[PDB]
Write a protein that binds this ligand. Sequence first.
Ligand code: ZN
Lengths: 60, 24, 206, 127, 80, 63, 98, 155
Amino acid sequence: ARKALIEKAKRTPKFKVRAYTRCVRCGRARSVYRFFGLCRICLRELAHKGQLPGVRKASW
Amino acid sequence: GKGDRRTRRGKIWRGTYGKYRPRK
Amino acid sequence: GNKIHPIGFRLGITRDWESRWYAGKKQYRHLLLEDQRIRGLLEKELYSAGLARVDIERAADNVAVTVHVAKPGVVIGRGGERIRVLREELAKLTGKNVALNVQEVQNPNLSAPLVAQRVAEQIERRFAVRRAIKQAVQRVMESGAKGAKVIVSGRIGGAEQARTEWAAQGRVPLHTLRANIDYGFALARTTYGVLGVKAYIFLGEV
Amino acid sequence: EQYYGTGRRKEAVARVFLRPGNGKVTVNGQDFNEYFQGLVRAVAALEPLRAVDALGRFDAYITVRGGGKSGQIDAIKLGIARALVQYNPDYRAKLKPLGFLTRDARVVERKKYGKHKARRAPQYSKR
Amino acid sequence: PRSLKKGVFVDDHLLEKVLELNAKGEKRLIKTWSRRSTIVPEMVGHTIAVYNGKQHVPVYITENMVGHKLGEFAPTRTYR
Amino acid sequence: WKLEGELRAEVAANIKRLMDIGCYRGLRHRRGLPVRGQRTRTNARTRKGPRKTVAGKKKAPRK
Amino acid sequence: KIRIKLRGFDHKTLDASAQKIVEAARRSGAQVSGPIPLPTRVRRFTVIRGPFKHKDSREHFELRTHNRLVDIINPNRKTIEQLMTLDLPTGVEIEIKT
Amino acid sequence: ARRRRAEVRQLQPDLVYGDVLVTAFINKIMRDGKKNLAARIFYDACKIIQEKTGQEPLKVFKQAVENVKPRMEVRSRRVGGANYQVPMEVSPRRQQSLALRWLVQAANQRPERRAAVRIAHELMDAAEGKGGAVKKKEDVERMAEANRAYAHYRW
RNA sequence: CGUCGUCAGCUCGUGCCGUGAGGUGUUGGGUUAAGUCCCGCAACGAGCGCAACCCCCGCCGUUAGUUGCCAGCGGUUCGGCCGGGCACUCUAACGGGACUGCCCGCGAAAGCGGGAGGAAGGAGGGGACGACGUCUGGUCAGCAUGGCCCUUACGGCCUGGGCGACACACGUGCUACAAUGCCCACUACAAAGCGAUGCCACCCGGCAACGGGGAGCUAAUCGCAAAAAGGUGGGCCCAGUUCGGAUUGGGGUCUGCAACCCGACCCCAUGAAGCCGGAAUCGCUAGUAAUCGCGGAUCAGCCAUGCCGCGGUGAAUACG
Ligand SMILES: [Zn+2]
């Protein structure tokens, strides 16, 4: 997660297979959920704050 | 068994279709 | 390393969300990244105003945003000149076209985020940690609240060994799913390093 | 004229309709012995009847959807047990002591994380 | 049991560079990083030097090895 | 169909080929290791034969 | 025959919302098909609790979406009057197809 | 079981003989919860006991269980160093569990290719007093009463 | 964030005891899943924890009916297809219900045993939830951050290779050694999910993967989807086999600029080890184990036999 390696936003894939999610908050490329643009961590951090609209804690 | 890729189960297990587990 | 966020834990009850708006699939991620952009600047700016919460409602290209402050003045500005700068700096971020209300905090002494920041700051100024803490719990405890508690991380006093300071009064049931405990965290950059600050305030119950 | 009793088991719902008649049963159309073609358990469902010497006195139309033919066999058994009460509410005295009027609450157990099957915990070696 | 489909792929770095040499006959060496390319007849007789990922190894391309893919003749790892 | 001996002749003939040309796939035949790109750090006994145990390094949780 | 479909995250921000729509038009059109529920679609997000390892941490998060219908047959101007511009909830979003 | 005295699960009687003991035996035949195939096998067998034997299957069965129930068994125990095998009675409860288990085991130890038969023939042999089932049973008692010296460690 | 540990504990205030560290309370007797409660007592109360308040499953009712059914009537291409109807199933929102509340027995009390009613009990079943602290626990590689170090580079772009190497050792798993089985055919019951260039109906070309064409769906109203185990009929006949599918030769599809290194899938041929596993060792107390298939996230594709979750069938045993 180096500024330098956030060339992901560059579109210019030369070929669209070189495209890759990346966290829209920490750059955590490794486990980024689509529906949020966030990585498994941030998703959890924000869900705790309440900044994830209608994203309550599951249980059953 | 579940492992023979050219049998009913072998196809079901591998979640696929072919001459051994046709669509219908 | 245990215990959940007291808020996220209670979201179903005794605590509403900071962004209450429907959306989905193709939008949600875009319509959310925004909210963070919003909150981003507000906290970066309205610091001296005393930030505490940033509600963000929506319906369509007419956002809400209801910054909550201790010093509503600092926000607004002279006659309302600043609420002009920001409110505009806002659309230079979201063409969306959005409002910008401002509610005042009735006693910043019951705002976990505030009490936290309050302590976070003192610590940055080099005040005695344990004192600042005890004081804080007192203020909070001394102006309502059926319970309060503050926690400072480590490297108290710049000490080479990271410690952890306490302080608490009255019921502060983290387990009771219905307490209504305000949680607030404050950082604290320093010559020697970061030191997190946690504020917990208990009010009523049911 | 007609009698009703639902009946649910391990996630199965059975609409049980008794009607004074021969003693046959139409489960989802097919004959009782046709839907449960070869299931040593089937016989169970009608046990609440033999309970009070019914069957060859009643008749039953039954709709069954949900679960498996085994769970259905118990839902239906409960249905025939309930309906048999709207008819004569006096049946309880003998129908209940058998427990036919209970709703077996045994359901699948949630699959917890960290474990392979809700309980089946993963194994270790030279721990 | 390999397979590409319809359109035998060959990078045109060496392609249009190998046949250009077909005009004057052949040449004396080549060198491409395109070990990704399939081998076509026009390559026969030639001598393309492929990249290990470290070196440029000289590979004489004969008929018997047409359908293959250059890299299959330029070993990567070093063992024993 | 091409059956029996004549067939084993073909197959053998094939292998011999990709084996004569620097063909990596052919080297995998020479070296006697799996050809269809599988792992050779573990599980290759069907192609290697019986395990050929050697001395090793204990205390270094090879578990 | 104006088919309304209401979706929201809060099962109250709808029962409130979609219920207004029922009492309102119940004085300018048919009699409404009552706010019929409709199955909820839940989204689960199972995440490892901490960063770096601890494969068995977890903790579950779900984003349940609720739906409502209603349905007003016999549309009569005033219906599209009591409704047209008199809503209130913010955590809701409608879609209508008469 | 540190606390309670774990009570015995009561089983629903047979769907043909209404005999609980039968369900039990059928459960011991069952594997992977395929209780149908399990029930079948035992019934097919009961009909094999009807043909080759003019007796009622149900009575042949119970007779079997009877001869296969051990009345004395040896239980290990550490007593001053060595682990002496102490001989002792067998609960009525445990007798059954063992009898049924042993039958199915010896039954699946027979040769006849058909599952339903092995059970059929095993049961009969057991009734007569012969068969792999009764072997184990008599082997157990032999084991005890052969260690009836350490029986003063009664337990 | 993991962990002891969901363990039943850890403390405070004032009082009292002690020169003091400290003690008392928190110990004792009964009881409990529990520092749970009861009785006792120089202690009287309190805080964190237990429990409860929240979620899913059990039963009933109200509201709501494009899910549902002749329940009930007329028609039928007799498909709940048509009209019609909300009863029922269901969908989702709310309300009721359990509290040792009632009856008998013992007890000082808490409560223990038993019984009735009840869908259900004596914490009805499963989650969320983890105290004061411990391990100088884990992560500066998610992010944040003190200090140290590098700045034509310890930065940056690219092509290619590597992370996929192997004589070997271990862990977690998948498939299996077969007849309570394998194969072919016919036929039947599920839940929870996901779908815009996305799910893909149906029709055609292909043995097939898949290709061409194209309807509906914006998704309780269309698609993924076939559930598998199972039931019925046939084949196999105990053999390394119609078990088992490794490995290898060939042909080919598909994604992607590109599948040598290094993708998955299909079809032909090949058809290995394996006939139930030494010492040693792991899981689980009921709808659990065992067994069977189904979905999802990530994601072009995929090395998923992993992970998170769903329902089907459904035990043994616990003296101690
Ligand atoms: Zn992130």
